[PDB]
């Protein structure tokens, strides 16, 4: 007998907002599961749940890397109000 | 006997809004599952749930990488109000 | 007999907001699990849950790395108010 | 995996022979069985294998029991030979 | 894994022979069994294997028991030979 | 893993032979068993294997027991030979 009681009442402005510049590897809210709720299981073999192997931002082989850039970031944010009254 | 009680009452402005620039690898809200609720299972073999293997933002072989760019980011946000009254 | 009582009532502005510049490897809110709730399980073998192997920001082989850049970061944030009254 | 190896090579003159007088309750070679060889059985309920309840040779109610008998037992057995050579 | 190796090579003149007089309750070679060989059985309830309840040779109620008998037992046995050579 | 090796090579003239008079309660060679060989059994309840309850040779209620008997036992046994050579 397994009983699970999961509650997530409220979320306000969870993630990734009001950003001038976002880049790169940013996966979010990803759920990978096997036999999350299991009862009376004889066997389970050869399970592979590897998310990734190698993280390399710059991987160059016999390369000539010459980027020229002049980037100006001038984002403006005014009067942002977040309210979560709870009674 | 397995009993699950999952509640998600409210979400307001979850993700990825009011952004000047978004790029790259950003998958979201992805669910991959096998036998999430299982009862009286004899066996389960050779399960592969690998999400990915290799993350490489720049992967170059015998390359001449010469990008010239002049990018100006001038986004403006005014009077953003988020309200979640709860009584 | 397994009983689980998990509660997450409230979240306000969780992560990654009001940022001038975000880059790199930043995955978030990722859950990988195997047999999270298990009862009367005879055996489980050969489980692999490796998230990653190698983290290398700069990985170069026989490379000439000559980037020229003049980047100016001038983001402005005014009058940000976060309120979470609880009664 | 259940393996049963039952051998009964030889029987010679098993029972109830060369008898002058046999009477009464003598049942023989009676086998009563339920699920003699069973594998992976979830449940089994309300099994009744009672052979008998009450043994009463003389059961009399308000009876007048007056038997007169003159019985002579004069059986003769000569030169009975039992041979079971085993090589 | 259950392995049973039962051997009964030889029996010679097992029981109840060359008897002048046999009477009463004498059942023989009676086997009553439930789930003799069982593997991976969750439950088994309410099993009744009672052979008998009450043994009463003389059970009389308000009875007049007056038997007259003159019994002579004159059985003769000569030259009984039992041989079981084993080599 | 349960392994049973039972051997009963030889029996010669087991029981109840060459008897002048046999009476009463004499059951023989009776086997009553439940789950003789059992492996990985969760539960077993309410088992009743009572062979008998009460043994009363003379049970009389308000009885007049007046048996008259003149019994003569004159059985004769001559030259009984039992041989079990083992080499």
Residue numbers in the entry:
A (entry chain D), B (entry chain B), C (entry chain F), D (entry chain A), E (entry chain C), F (entry chain E): 6 to 92
Paper lines:
β2-microglobulin (β2m) and its truncated variant ΔΝ6 are co-deposited in amyloid fibrils in the joints, causing the disorder dialysis-related amyloidosis (DRA). We show that the aggregation of each variant in vitro results in fibrils that are polymorphic, which contain different numbers of protofilaments and different numbers of β2m subunits per layer of the amyloid fibril structure. High resolution structures, however, show that this polymorphism arises from the assembly of a common building block that is strikingly homogeneous and monomorphic.
